[PDB]
Design a binder for this molecule. Structure first.
Ligand SMILES: CC(=O)N[C@@H]1[C@@H](O)[C@H](O)[C@@H](CO)O[C@H]1O
Ligand SMILES: *[C@@H]1O[C@H](CO)[C@@H](O)[C@H](O)[C@H]1NC(C)=O
Lengths: 49, 106
């Protein structure tokens, strides 16, 4: 008598919420959140560096 | 119903040795009420008698051990488990959503 069995690998049902993600990171960009006070005039700004 | 799913499949025939009995020193298959039972026998002349619904007496086979009765359901689908025999042909019949999925909280 014969029995055929096969198996395979698939994503887990929780992969939508529990997954690590692998990135390639390069060319960082710097920003600053500065309080600037000039001549009694104050402002809060975001400045690209 | 979130993203996840599993597959519900057409079940395979489940052998039942209670159907086969020895009535008059000859085998007799009594399928359950309103259910087919394919009878496969290997005595003199192979028996492939599928469409029996009420009762069938086989006198060719004199022993219960040389006949096998398989219950046929073919109406309610089952999970694609590995501890169940596979039905012939295409079996994929639908998708069952997976409850209690992992979720974010505090
Ligand atoms: C015992 C019983 O319910 N028998 C019925 C009968 O109409 C027939 O044997 C079959 C059709 O093939 O459908 C079933
Ligand atoms: C900078 O500005 C923020 C804006 O509300 C303020 O909360 C903070 O106190 C300021 N910092 C200084 C040193 O004044």
């Amino acid at each position: 008598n014969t029995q055929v069995s096969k198996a395979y690998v698939m994503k887990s049902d929780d992969c939508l919420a529990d997954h690590a993600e692998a990135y390639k990171a390069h060319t960082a960009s710097v920003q600053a959140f500065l309080n600037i006070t000039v001549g009694e005039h104050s402002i809060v700004t975001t400045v690209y560096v | 119903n979130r993203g996840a799913y599993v597959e519900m499949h057409l079940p395979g025939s489940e052998v039942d040795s209670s159907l086969v009995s020895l009535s008059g020193s000859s085998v007799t298959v009594t399928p359950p009420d309103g259910t087919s039972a394919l009878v496969e026998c290997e005595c003199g002349g192979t028996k492939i008698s599928e469409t029996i619904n009420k009762t069938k007496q086989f006198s060719q086979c004199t022993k219960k051990e040389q006949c096998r009765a398989y219950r046929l359901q073919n109406d309610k689908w089952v999970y694609n488990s590995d501890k169940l025999p596979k039905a012939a042909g295409a079996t994929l019949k639908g998708k069952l959503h997976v409850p209690f999925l992992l979720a974010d909280g505090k």
